[PDB]
Design a protein around this ligand. Structure first.
Ligand SMILES: [Mg+2]
Ligand SMILES: [Mg+2]
Ligand SMILES: [Mg+2]
Ligand SMILES: [Mg+2]
Ligand SMILES: [Mg+2]
Ligand SMILES: [Mg+2]
Ligand SMILES: [Mg+2]
Ligand SMILES: [Mg+2]
Ligand SMILES: [Mg+2]
Ligand SMILES: [Mg+2]
Ligand SMILES: [Mg+2]
Ligand SMILES: [Mg+2]
Ligand SMILES: [Mg+2]
Ligand SMILES: [Mg+2]
Ligand SMILES: [Mg+2]
Ligand SMILES: [Mg+2]
Ligand SMILES: [Mg+2]
Ligand SMILES: [Mg+2]
Ligand SMILES: [Mg+2]
Ligand SMILES: [Mg+2]
Lengths: 44, 98, 181, 136, 58, 91, 120
RNA sequence: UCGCCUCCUAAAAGGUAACGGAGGCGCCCAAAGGUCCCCUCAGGCGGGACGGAAAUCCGCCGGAGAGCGCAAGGGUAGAAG
RNA sequence: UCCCCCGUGCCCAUAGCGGCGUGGAACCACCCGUUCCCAUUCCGAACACGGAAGUGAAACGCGCCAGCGCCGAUGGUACUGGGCGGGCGACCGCCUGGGAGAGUAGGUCGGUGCGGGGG
């Protein structure tokens, strides 16, 4: 499903596409956001 | 074969091609787009007996002094069979920052 | 160690014997020994928790070297395993480890296969490369009945630096291989 | 017997690889005009010859029908026709040697290859022997 | 030659028939059943007409 | 097998065919001359003596060159030899 | 301790533990244990290795066994299938050989009954 | 049948049609992505305990005929495997 | 200034494969060991480090060979811009310029730069 990474209790959905049966479930990806550079970005 | 060719993944100029023999180590700055070897340095036909890590450091010192002898500061490492290791070219005098 | 007894017998008798046999022209022209590989086919990856990597430790305790699980290249549906992964055990023995393994093999293991009239000297054929199978894996001087669950027959292949088969024949027959004639 | 075929008409233009010489046997039918030689005309001429000189010699059919001749079943135009009305067709350009008879004498060969040319749709020459060769 | 190992301690190999092979293996004390001193050896079969000339004659 | 042949000096192969001449080359690794041998005699020469027998070309200037008839380009349609070239023998 | 071939018995009495070696039965196991000289009722989980090899020197060297015996039995069978003796034929198709009736019986030389038979 | 992709028809730039020929897509992948470092394929010949004639292993010949998630081309090991 | 060797490129098989002999003063490699760095889903086989006891045996270099390969002209057909005709047709013919592919003669196991090391 089309799932968007959020900055951790913050903004900046990062909008990836996960393959939910194959692993998901706290998708964690370091990512550069619009504000406050670099974070953890758990999905949805 | 050692078909490795960490040759042709070098298109930036001033290609420092090394050669780690069983006896010596050779090194030479080649120019690209006009293939002319600019400076070079052997190890055992320059200096110290076959303590090869230290003399491979010393051939690099001598080569970088030869490079600043004609003023070349940005280069690019080579010799695809490298495995960058105890054949050391941890140097000053060449601002590749290698 | 470095003074393997078979290695000493090689370096002190066999190389001058092959020199005085064939009329060689170089010390490196004599057939040296460089490879003893042991393969374990082992198509056993079914359900009900069929682990079967105890045989890897069994082979490691035989030879003295931990074998690698090798994933199947092609997937065929005749035997039901597929998609690469599951099992084939390989170990490769070079110098003194190969020599201590051949000291354990040629003198202790083969003399015993359950009948053992000999080896099969039609088996070299062109390269150096003497290959020989083993029906029962537990002829070796380490592992008897109470360390296994099933019979794990491997096959070894010893490779020489010999261009033909006659040269490797004359090498291994004096290293201690018997044959069938 | 293979790769997908309801293939196009082509065009029976100039003949150079379409026609070299007679290789097998002695005598040979050879075409003088480009035409489509069917499998039915191949079988018809060949069983004219083998039944003319009965239990005779070798009749090499050097052509081979490899082109699906297509015929619509008497209707309008929606796609290619169903294919292979009598079957396949050897595209034959002139100068091509179609049939060769081997070993059998000239009196049976000239009165066999003439029959083959009579069942073929092409005006033909009949060559004797001693054509193009290469060996030293 | 890495971290994991079988550690290959020197090991005499006694046999039953008396031959000792000084080799390298795991489990440094090892003795076996048969090694050399079984090389060309025991009972060979008595042939056909030999036994049938043994059994009877007229 | 002797045979008379002339010297083409680069004069229009289709005009030689119009004349009835069979054009050709006389060639080896020593010489290379375009020729025309007359076809109304070359057919009688060549169907008698094949490519296994040594022809000898007599030229307009004396030369009775030994040769092997090397290759014939047939006319693909309209059956006749269309070009010849002669492997001239070497000494 | 293995004895012959590889055939190792454990935790059993020795004079029937020898029977698991092919070619040794109950009678030879009675005989060639006290013949060498061993108490024939010592459980082989505790058999002295000197007595194991003093037993094995009589086991292997005296009579032929698994392999050299087994193979001569099979070679006797292949020798019997020669041109057609009556005992080598019917080894050749598995029927019995020493006077067995086969009209109803012989399920240990035949099979699995293939019951394809029967009238109407 | 209606959109998209691959050839071909397409006439050696491109484009080009028909209810012309022949196939596919409506996805997938947190490693089948990035980078660093290694390694070479399929096949055939032999030789090898169960082992299919192609499991796994060894040795030669193997320059791409293997692979690249998927159709088809283009490409490609001096990697895209 | 020339051959010898080492790297490094260019043209990309006219230099490749397979042969057939030669090389070891150096160079280069094999080797001798795994303590040292780092190593291999196992294996210092590879990679790497230490060494220099021995050897050119492989590998490589350098020569001869045409067997395979590769290149391959002169011609001449094919094909064809352009023109002009014949053919109810399938298609063909002539002139004008181009002009192959295969084939045949043959050519061919390098050529060439750059920096080192050596008589
Ligand atoms: Mg949704
Ligand atoms: Mg380089
Ligand atoms: Mg009876
Ligand atoms: Mg186009
Ligand atoms: Mg990828
Ligand atoms: Mg095999
Ligand atoms: Mg096998
Ligand atoms: Mg591929
Ligand atoms: Mg798909
Ligand atoms: Mg492609
Ligand atoms: Mg070249
Ligand atoms: Mg040769
Ligand atoms: Mg020589
Ligand atoms: Mg020297
Ligand atoms: Mg090298
Ligand atoms: Mg050599
Ligand atoms: Mg050509
Ligand atoms: Mg040409
Ligand atoms: Mg050559
Ligand atoms: Mg050359």
């Amino acid at each position: 499903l089309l799932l968007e990474c959020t900055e951790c209790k913050r903004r900046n959905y990062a909008t990836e596409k996960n393959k939910r049966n194959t692993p998901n479930k706290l998708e964690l990806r370091k990512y550069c956001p619009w504000c406050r550079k670099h974070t953890v970005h758990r999905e949805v | 074969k050692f078909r490795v060719r960490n040759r042709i993944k070098r298109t930036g100029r001033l290609r420092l091609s090394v050669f780690r023999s069983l006896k010596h180590i050779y090194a030479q700055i080649i120019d690209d787009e006009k293939g002319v070897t600019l400076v070079s340095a052997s190890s055992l036909a320059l200096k110290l007996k076959g303590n090869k890590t230290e003399v491979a450091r010393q051939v690099g010192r001598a080569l970088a002094e030869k490079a600043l002898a004609l003023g070349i500061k940005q280069v690019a490492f080579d010799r695809g069979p490298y495995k960058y290791h105890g054949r050391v070219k941890a140097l000053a005098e060449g601002a590749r920052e290698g | 160690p470095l003074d393997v007894a078979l290695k000493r017998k090689y370096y002190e008798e066999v190389r001058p014997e092959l020199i005085r046999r064939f009329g060689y022209q170089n010390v490196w022209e004599v057939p040296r020994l460089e490879k003893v590989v042991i393969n374990q086919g082992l198509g056993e990856a079914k359900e009900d928790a069929r682990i079967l990597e105890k045989a890897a430790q069994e082979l490691a305790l035989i030879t003295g070297q931990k074998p690698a699980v090798t994933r199947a290249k092609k997937s065929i549906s005749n035997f039901k395993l597929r998609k690469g992964m599951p099992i084939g055990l390989r170990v490769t023995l070079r110098r003194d480890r190969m020599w201590i393994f051949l000291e354990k093999l040629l003198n202790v293991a083969l003399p015993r296969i359950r009948d053992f009239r000999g080896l099969n000297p039609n088996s070299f054929d062109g390269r150096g490369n003497y290959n020989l199978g083993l029906r029962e894996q537990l002829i070796f001087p380490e592992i008897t009945y109470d360390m296994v669950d099933a019979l794990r027959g491997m096959d070894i292949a010893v490779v020489t630096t010999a261009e033909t088969d006659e040269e490797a024949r004359a090498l291994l027959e004096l290293l201690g291989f018997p044959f069938r004639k | 017997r293979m790769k997908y075929r309801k293939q196009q008409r082509g065009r029976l233009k100039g003949a150079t690889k379409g026609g070299d010489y007679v290789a097998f046997g002695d005598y040979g039918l050879v075409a003088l005009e480009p035409a489509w030689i069917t499998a039915q005309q191949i079988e018809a001429a060949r069983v004219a010859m083998v039944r003319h000189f009965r239990r005779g010699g070798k009749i090499f059919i050097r052509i081979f029908p490899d082109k699906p001749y297509t015929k619509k079943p008497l209707e309008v135009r929606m796609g290619k026709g169903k294919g292979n009305v009598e079957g396949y067709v050897a595209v034959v350009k002139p100068g091509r040697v179609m049939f060769e008879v081997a070993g059998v004498t000239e009196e049976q060969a000239m009165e066999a290859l003439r029959i083959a040319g009579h069942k073929l749709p092409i005006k033909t020459k009949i060559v004797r022997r001693d054509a193009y060769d290469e060996a030293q | 030659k890495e971290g994991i190992h079988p550690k290959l301690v020197p090991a005499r190999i006694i046999c039953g028939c008396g031959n000792v092979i000084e080799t390298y293996s795991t489990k440094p004390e090892i003795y076996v059943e048969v090694c050399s001193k079984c090389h060309p050896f025991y009972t060979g079969q008595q042939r056909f007409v030999d036994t049938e000339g043994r059994v009877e004659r007229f | 097998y002797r045979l008379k042949a002339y010297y083409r000096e680069g004069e229009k192969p289709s005009a030689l065919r119009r004349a009835g001449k069979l054009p050709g080359v006389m060639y080896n690794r020593h010489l290379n001359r375009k020729v025309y041998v007359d076809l109304v005699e070359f057919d009688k020469v060549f169907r008698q003596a094949s490519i296994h027998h040594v022809i000898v070309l007599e030229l307009p200037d004396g030369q009775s060159l030994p040769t092997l008839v090397r290759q014939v380009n047939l006319d693909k349609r309209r059956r006749r030899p269309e070009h010849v070239d002669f492997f001239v023998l070497s000494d | 301790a293995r004895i012959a071939g590889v055939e190792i018995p454990r935790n059993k009495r020795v004079d029937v533990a020898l029977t698991y070696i092919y070619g040794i039965g109950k009678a030879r196991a009675k005989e060639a244990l006290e013949k060498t000289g061993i108490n024939p009722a010592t459980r082989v989980k505790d058999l002295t290795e000197a007595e194991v090899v003093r037993l094995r020197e009589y086991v292997e060297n005296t009579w032929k066994l698994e392999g050299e015996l087994r193979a001569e039995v099979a070679a006797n069978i292949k020798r019997l299938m020669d041109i057609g003796c009556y005992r080598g034929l019917r080894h050749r198709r598995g029927l019995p050989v020493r006077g067995q009736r086969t009209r109803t019986n012989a399920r240990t030389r035949k099979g699995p009954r293939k019951t394809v038979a029967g009238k109407k």
